[PDB]
Amino acid sequence: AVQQVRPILSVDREEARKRALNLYKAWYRQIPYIVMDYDIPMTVEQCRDKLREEFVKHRNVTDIRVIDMLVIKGQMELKESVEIWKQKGHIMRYWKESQDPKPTDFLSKFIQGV
Amino acid sequence: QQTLPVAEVAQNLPKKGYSPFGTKQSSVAEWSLARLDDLLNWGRKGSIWPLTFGLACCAVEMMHIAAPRYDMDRYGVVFRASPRQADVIIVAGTLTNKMAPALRKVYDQMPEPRWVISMGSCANGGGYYHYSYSVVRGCDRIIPVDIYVPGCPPTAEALMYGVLQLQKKVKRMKTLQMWYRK
Amino acid sequence: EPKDIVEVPKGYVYVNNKELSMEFADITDRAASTMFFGELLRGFAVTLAHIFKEPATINYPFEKGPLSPRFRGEHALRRYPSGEERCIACKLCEAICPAQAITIEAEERADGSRRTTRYDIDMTKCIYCGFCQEACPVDAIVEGPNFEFSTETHEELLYNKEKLLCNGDKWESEIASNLQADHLYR
Amino acid sequence: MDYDGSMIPAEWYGWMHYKTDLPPIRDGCRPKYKWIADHSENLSGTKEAYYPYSTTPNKVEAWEPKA
Amino acid sequence: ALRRDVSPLIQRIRAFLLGREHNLALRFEDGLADRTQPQPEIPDGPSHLLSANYYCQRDGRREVLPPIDLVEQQKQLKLPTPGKVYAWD
Amino acid sequence: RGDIEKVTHTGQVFDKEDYRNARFVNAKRYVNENWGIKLIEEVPPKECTERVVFCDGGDGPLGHPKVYINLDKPGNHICGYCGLRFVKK
Amino acid sequence: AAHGVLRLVLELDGETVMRADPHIGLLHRGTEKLIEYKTYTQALPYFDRLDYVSMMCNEQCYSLAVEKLLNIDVPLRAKYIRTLFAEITRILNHIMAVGTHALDVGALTPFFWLFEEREKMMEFYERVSGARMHAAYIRPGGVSLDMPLGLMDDIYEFASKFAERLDEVEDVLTTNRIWVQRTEDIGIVTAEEALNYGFSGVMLRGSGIKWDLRKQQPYDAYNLVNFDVPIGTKGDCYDRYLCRVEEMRQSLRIIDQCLNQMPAGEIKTDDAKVAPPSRSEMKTSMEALIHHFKLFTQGYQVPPGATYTAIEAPKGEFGVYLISDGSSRPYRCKIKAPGFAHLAALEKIGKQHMLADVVAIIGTLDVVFGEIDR
Amino acid sequence: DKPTVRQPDAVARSHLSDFGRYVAECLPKYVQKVQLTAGDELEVLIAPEGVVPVLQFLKDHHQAQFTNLVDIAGVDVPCRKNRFEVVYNLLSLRYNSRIRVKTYTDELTPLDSACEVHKAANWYEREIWDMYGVFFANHPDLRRILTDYGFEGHPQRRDFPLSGYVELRYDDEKKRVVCEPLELAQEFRKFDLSAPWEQFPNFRNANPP
Amino acid sequence: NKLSGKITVPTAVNLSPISGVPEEHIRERRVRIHIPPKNAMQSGTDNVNTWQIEFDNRERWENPLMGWASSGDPLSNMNVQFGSPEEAITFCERNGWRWYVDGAAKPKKERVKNYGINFAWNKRTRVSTK
Amino acid sequence: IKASTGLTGLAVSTNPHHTLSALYGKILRAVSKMPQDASYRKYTEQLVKQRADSVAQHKDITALEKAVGCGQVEELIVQAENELILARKMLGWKPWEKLVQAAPAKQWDWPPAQIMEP
Numbered sequence A: 001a002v003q004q005v006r007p008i009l010s011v012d013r014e015e016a017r018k019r020a021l022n023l024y025k026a027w028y029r030q031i032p033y034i035v036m037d038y039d040i041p042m043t044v045e046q047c048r049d050k051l052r053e054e055f056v057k058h059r060n061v062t063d064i065r066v067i068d069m070l071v072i073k074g075q076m077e078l079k080e081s082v083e084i085w086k087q088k089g090h091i092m093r094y095w096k097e098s099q100d101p102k103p104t105d106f107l108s109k110f111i112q113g114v
Numbered sequence B: 001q002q003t004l005p006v007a008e009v010a011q012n013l014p015k016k017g018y019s020p021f022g023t024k025q026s027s028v029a030e031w032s033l034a035r036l037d038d039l040l041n042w043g044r045k046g047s048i049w050p051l052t053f054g055l056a057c058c059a060v061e062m063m064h065i066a067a068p069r070y071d072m073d074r075y076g077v078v079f080r081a082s083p084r085q086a087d088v089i090i091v092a093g094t095l096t097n098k099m100a101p102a103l104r105k106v107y108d109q110m111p112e113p114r115w116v117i118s119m120g121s122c123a124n125g126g127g128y129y130h131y132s133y134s135v136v137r138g139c140d141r142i143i144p145v146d147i148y149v150p151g152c153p154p155t156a157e158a159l160m161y162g163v164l165q166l167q168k169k170v171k172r173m174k175t176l177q178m179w180y181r182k
Numbered sequence C: 001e002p003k004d005i006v007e008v009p010k011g012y013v014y015v016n017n018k019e020l021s022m023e024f025a026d027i028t029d030r031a032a033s034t035m036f037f038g039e040l041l042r043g044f045a046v047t048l049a050h051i052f053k054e055p056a057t058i059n060y061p062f063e064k065g066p067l068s069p070r071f072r073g074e075h076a077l078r079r080y081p082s083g084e085e086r087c088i089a090c091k092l093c094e095a096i097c098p099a100q101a102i103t104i105e106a107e108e109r110a111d112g113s114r115r116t117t118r119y120d121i122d123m124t125k126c127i128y129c130g131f132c133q134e135a136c137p138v139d140a141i142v143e144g145p146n147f148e149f150s151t152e153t154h155e156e157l158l159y160n161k162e163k164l165l166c167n168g169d170k171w172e173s174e175i176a177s178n179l180q181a182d183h184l185y186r
Numbered sequence D: 001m002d003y004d005g006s007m008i009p010a011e012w013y014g015w016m017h018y019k020t021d022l023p024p025i026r027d028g029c030r031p032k033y034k035w036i037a038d039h040s041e042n043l044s045g046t047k048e049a050y051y052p053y054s055t056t057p058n059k060v061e062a063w064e065p066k067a
Numbered sequence E: 001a002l003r004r005d006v007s008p009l010i011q012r013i014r015a016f017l018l019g020r021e022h023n024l025a026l027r028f029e030d031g032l033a034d035r036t037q038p039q040p041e042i043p044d045g046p047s048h049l050l051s052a053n054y055y056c057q058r059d060g061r062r063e064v065l066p067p068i069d070l071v072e073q074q075k076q077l078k079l080p081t082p083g084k085v086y087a088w089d
Numbered sequence F: 001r002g003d004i005e006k007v008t009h010t011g012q013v014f015d016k017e018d019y020r021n022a023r024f025v026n027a028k029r030y031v032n033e034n035w036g037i038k039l040i041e042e043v044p045p046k047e048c049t050e051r052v053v054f055c056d057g058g059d060g061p062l063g064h065p066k067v068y069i070n071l072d073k074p075g076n077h078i079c080g081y082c083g084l085r086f087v088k089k
Numbered sequence G: 001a002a003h004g005v006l007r008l009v010l011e012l013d014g015e016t017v018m019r020a021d022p023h024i025g026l027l028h029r030g031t032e033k034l035i036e037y038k039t040y041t042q043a044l045p046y047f048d049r050l051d052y053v054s055m056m057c058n059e060q061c062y063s064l065a066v067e068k069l070l071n072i073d074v075p076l077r078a079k080y081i082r083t084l085f086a087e088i089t090r091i092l093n094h095i096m097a098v099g100t101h102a103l104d105v106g107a108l109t110p111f112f113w114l115f116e117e118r119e120k121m122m123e124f125y126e127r128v129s130g131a132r133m134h135a136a137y138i139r140p141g142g143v144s145l146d147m148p149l150g151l152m153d154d155i156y157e158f159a160s161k162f163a164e165r166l167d168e169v170e171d172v173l174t175t176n177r178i179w180v181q182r183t184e185d186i187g188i189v190t191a192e193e194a195l196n197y198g199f200s201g202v203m204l205r206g207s208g209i210k211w212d213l214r215k216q217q218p219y220d221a222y223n224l225v226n227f228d229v230p231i232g233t234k235g236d237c238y239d240r241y242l243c244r245v246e247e248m249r250q251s252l253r254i255i256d257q258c259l260n261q262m263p264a265g266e267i268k269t270d271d272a273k274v275a276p277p278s279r280s281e282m283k284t285s286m287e288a289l290i291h292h293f294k295l296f297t298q299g300y301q302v303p304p305g306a307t308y309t310a311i312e313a314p315k316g317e318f319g320v321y322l323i324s325d326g327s328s329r330p331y332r333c334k335i336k337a338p339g340f341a342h343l344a345a346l347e348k349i350g351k352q353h354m355l356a357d358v359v360a361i362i363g364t365l366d367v368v369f370g371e372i373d374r
Numbered sequence H: 001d002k003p004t005v006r007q008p009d010a011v012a013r014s015h016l017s018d019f020g021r022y023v024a025e026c027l028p029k030y031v032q033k034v035q036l037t038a039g040d041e042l043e044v045l046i047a048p049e050g051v052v053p054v055l056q057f058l059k060d061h062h063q064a065q066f067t068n069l070v071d072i073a074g075v076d077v078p079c080r081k082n083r084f085e086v087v088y089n090l091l092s093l094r095y096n097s098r099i100r101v102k103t104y105t106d107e108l109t110p111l112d113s114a115c116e117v118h119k120a121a122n123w124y125e126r127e128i129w130d131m132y133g134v135f136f137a138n139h140p141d142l143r144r145i146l147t148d149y150g151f152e153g154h155p156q157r158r159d160f161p162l163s164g165y166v167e168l169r170y171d172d173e174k175k176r177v178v179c180e181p182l183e184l185a186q187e188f189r190k191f192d193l194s195a196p197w198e199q200f201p202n203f204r205n206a207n208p209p
Numbered sequence I: 001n002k003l004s005g006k007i008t009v010p011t012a013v014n015l016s017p018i019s020g021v022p023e024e025h026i027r028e029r030r031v032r033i034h035i036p037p038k039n040a041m042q043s044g045t046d047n048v049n050t051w052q053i054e055f056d057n058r059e060r061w062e063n064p065l066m067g068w069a070s071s072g073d074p075l076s077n078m079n080v081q082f083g084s085p086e087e088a089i090t091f092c093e094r095n096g097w098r099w100y101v102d103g104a105a106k107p108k109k110e111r112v113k114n115y116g117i118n119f120a121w122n123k124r125t126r127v128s129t130k
Numbered sequence J: 001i002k003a004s005t006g007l008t009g010l011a012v013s014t015n016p017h018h019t020l021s022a023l024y025g026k027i028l029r030a031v032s033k034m035p036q037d038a039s040y041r042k043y044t045e046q047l048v049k050q051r052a053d054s055v056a057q058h059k060d061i062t063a064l065e066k067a068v069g070c071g072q073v074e075e076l077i078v079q080a081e082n083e084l085i086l087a088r089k090m091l092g093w094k095p096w097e098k099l100v101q102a103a104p105a106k107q108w109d110w111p112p113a114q115i116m117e118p
């Protein structure tokens, strides 16, 4: 079920990690600047914590190509935060603080509607 | 729904007064505070300074009003560029997501008493792009709108009619007279 | 006239081919223009002159206009000369409405007639395009000529059938005039 | 001093806009039906203001325990 | 007596200052058309001709074909240039 | 206030204990005064001779599309569009 | 001077602008997706919204696209009306560009004097279509509706006086030293650099290229009008401004030719399956009613295919690439507005000029918004 | 004798037709097919690898000299295994003619970049990248253009809801604008405008596999 | 040792994360691949020749204000077309959805549909009227 | 001598014949390296040689302009230079070879998404 297809950037899973971890470097190194530049509530530790979870967001990615794109997205978002194109609203977006975590257990769902 | 009075009813009725409050004030403090409100409203009513946000398509009418056919500075309206010196904001055109935080920021950087006119359908309720992934459905969801000028765009007459309606709202606002009760 | 600088064929006009002469009368002319701002004087006197043209400001709302019989403004649901509702809920107006600003729900009135129950327009979604009236097969709905319908509250703009019928009653005379003007022509 | 743009009535509106050259005093060919209302201003920001509301009687009937 | 104009003096100076003979710009009822006009009749069309007017033998939408493959066109069967050379120079 | 009591011809009154009444504490509940059902009732049923009549309701192209209504039945016959009423007898 | 939309992220040293990143997309209104969901007739106003300064030219582009797909032709009278209003829009757009440009530089009086005359033209749009701007007057089967009597004459006097009005501002502002030095030799656009960046319109025509869509790929009744386009040889904002001014003058004589020769006849393609029938016929005959019914509810199936078209819109070669899947609903509608490429080149055009020069460059680009992001 | 039906420029069809064969037999390895759409335009269907060679060939060779690259129009078509299609619509001032180049690609494999060929394209590749997600290889800077910052998904795809997944408002607790799950006052009412009766026979069996 | 950097990868590449759809929809919603139903009171059948996918209805209430049909569910109208079910299943997997095909129909069995049977000497199938 | 080329940047160039001749020589050799069964080759020689044969008879630059058509010499040299780059790239591209890839079935078929009879 294999296909002999073009690459994008990374030719092997290890190069993929090499690229993926490079991004993790830029983001870790950037966090303090954004805490200063963007006047938002978030603090360095929380921003670091979210960065960890947000990589964990997709741990079981497998395809070399898919993981390459995820890194391509990150390098973009890095630059948009590195330079201050984004806005305090845009950067906080990662927390989703407007909506309360909706009910999850069956009764709370049942008693609160579909 | 009500309707205008008929010729003979008008004949019976007296002058409609000038200050919308009327001249029924009881005591000296009441009567005095009525006049000071009238003066304040007169100042804020006669001189009103739009900010000229004017994103799009609607903006062209926002310029035609400045044009010499339906002259607007005739009424005491001037386009100050700087929001710190602008008293009113005529939000006109569509409000995309990229713009939403910008409009919010511009609005509250302006000092009050600040009134917003939502010109055009695109600002009123998102207009023709209402079911779009990128547009703020209306501008009521970013800022407190004061006057709605329907149209796509509103004919210039319609826009400055709305301006006069804002002047009427600025005329009847009760701040000193009713602080006295507060 | 000075000669050109690029030879031009037809179907074109070069707007800079004219040469800046070096003739002494020509240079001294330009020099005098710069030394005494003749060109500014020409423009200066123009604006002085053009004070003496009467301004074209309409003394609104006393003086006002002009429009044309086809102007697309406030919506109105007309009624037959008997007073009966013209709309039959054919729902074309909704089917064509580019903004989907129209909502209709129709049933049978007790007489057995095909008529609307709810007929709604959102003039915060309408574009005043007039596709609705161009489509309606009985001229039930029309872009009435009123355009000063400005409201302080957003809710006040969402018209339902009661509001629309009221406008039709209020504006019937004018709408009758326009249609008599344009029906055979539209 | 409470003049308004909407004070013009229907029969005169067209003339006032250069929309009809026939003064209402002169052309009696316009309709003279009964149901026609009388004019009204932009009644807004006042107790006389319109406010929308559903124009469909409710959809589904609830079961009545008493009956 | 025809158009509201500033008094004749100011008119002459105004013409002097502009440097071109001035012609009025504001639109008067006299200047513009008879603002109420007779009812127009739109002449009937050439496809409204009453006979020999079959739709099937004049319709376009049913006439258009799919795109043709030029190589396969040849398989069924002056260096070429896209069109007349234009001296955009 | 009567404004929030009247029965819309469509047949709606907010129940006496229904929170949607609240929206009219400060604004009128417009209800139209002409009910088409009553008006068309008042209009008398026109009568003719021919088995089949035609109505456009309005006049010329200012009414509804021309419709032919047969009258052979004993009763009335209501125009589908305008609600005019016909009776042959 | 930023159209209310544009957001340039500039990096400056001293006062000069080194890096100039424009963030187009502060207006983008997902109009390609919406155009897909609606019907061809319903989709028509969208185009009039785009490049909102150009009212009718945008519609004519779309109508030509559909007519090329449907394999239909409009009658001469419809062609001439389209031509007439194509040029009236040309005068509208160029007034808008000149007036905005005059404010960019800081001259108020020109803008106001011209916006007086802009009111007369809009009134004409109002006379025909019933809307100040944003008519729907041009439609696939030709124009939506006939013209009211006497509108010909009123156009004549308006054209009669426009020479005076344009010359008043022209004499005031063309020669003026401040304006000349303020615009001249700003953002030189060499010929080769112009082509490889995908330019068009008076920008291209100003840089020296003798190209134009009207004379080369004629699409409307322009076959029957003789006239000359203007061309510059300096590629400055100034001589570009002159080209626009002469274009106003040349358009004027185009209205002379067309308005003089206007023939009688129908005002709509004869195919009642394509354009709606008239109300008079509708209320009597049967298939007129069916066609009225089906066109307004379902629209008309357009034969499958992809087609491109372009028009000499005032901003430049405005184009619509339209793909139809055979249904009544367009499958894909990509729109090429000239302002797009015209603005991308700014990042290179604006290099090292002063800040005041950058603003004036944005003006001479005349990148009206809506057409850029949508 | 059918004034309604237009008559194309036949001689233009002649020139484009012979020229099209010229292109096919000059670039055998790349040109997959060359067809002449009935609208008189000329389409050139290539494989994804030859994108730059075709464009470079066109802009340069005497007989093509197609210098201006009008746009990069992106088309999405599910049910084509590699669906995302691209269109390079070019002009030639020397000969006064238009040509269209077309290619395909999936949502995953990258695609050649025209930045190195025509400087005009630079923004367009950014536009398709934002609007579909079609990567471009060797593109200098692939920053998004239109969509707002931190926008997830590429809306012009046909598997993307019209109104998007989220929408913005303003918070007072936070003095800031927050994105929220979608919530529509009146759900967008589609209309099912499907033809029951085939209105076009000519395209029925034509173009079959 | 390369063909312009070609690589060997599995054909079935899940693209849920790159896609951008929120995981809530991905994890709580199915897809109903089928052929659109034939309208009962029609007779042309050139709109049921395609294989179509859509998402199950979530909810619709009515706006308290104006009695519209409010719906806070984005993929309600979403609708896509395919040429064959296997194509759609291939697509649906690549976008990481849950789906369950709905078998359209077996090939129509020929019906004799003779005209003469309307008029028979013995068979019951003689028409009562014309 | 013509004063201007009528275009910005495109300057008046002397010795056009020498430049055009030199450009034609190089491109001819550039195609010389090509294989003998390449359509690109087959035509470039005849076209270029037609140009490079027209270069001589008309010493006057304006006369040569009319004889060659296709635009003025100033652009015309650029046309030649473009093609020089084309040949060098063309040799590097090997496009005379046969099809690299066959389109998948139903790739270039319009309209899409319609069932079929096997």
Ligand code: SF4
Pocket (backbone or CB within 6 Å): B056, B057, B058, B092, B093, B094, B119, B120, B121, B122, B123, B127, B128, B151, B152, B153, B154, G049
């Ligand atoms: S409301 Fe109408 S005029 Fe205003 S921006 Fe929207 S489309 Fe343009």
Ligand code: SF4
Pocket (backbone or CB within 6 Å): C086, C087, C088, C089, C090, C091, C092, C093, C094, C104, C135, C136, C137, C138, C139, C140, C141
């Ligand atoms: S088109 Fe006219 S008759 Fe039909 S539903 Fe709409 S308003 Fe009523």
Ligand code: SF4
Pocket (backbone or CB within 6 Å): C093, C096, C097, C098, C099, C100, C101, C102, C121, C125, C126, C127, C128, C129, C130, C131, C132, C133
């Ligand atoms: S004018 Fe146009 S948008 Fe407004 S209700 Fe009528 S059809 Fe709909």
Ligand SMILES: [Zn+2]
Pocket (backbone or CB within 6 Å): F055, F056, F057, F058, F064, F079, F080, F081, F082, F083, F084
């Ligand atoms: Zn009737």
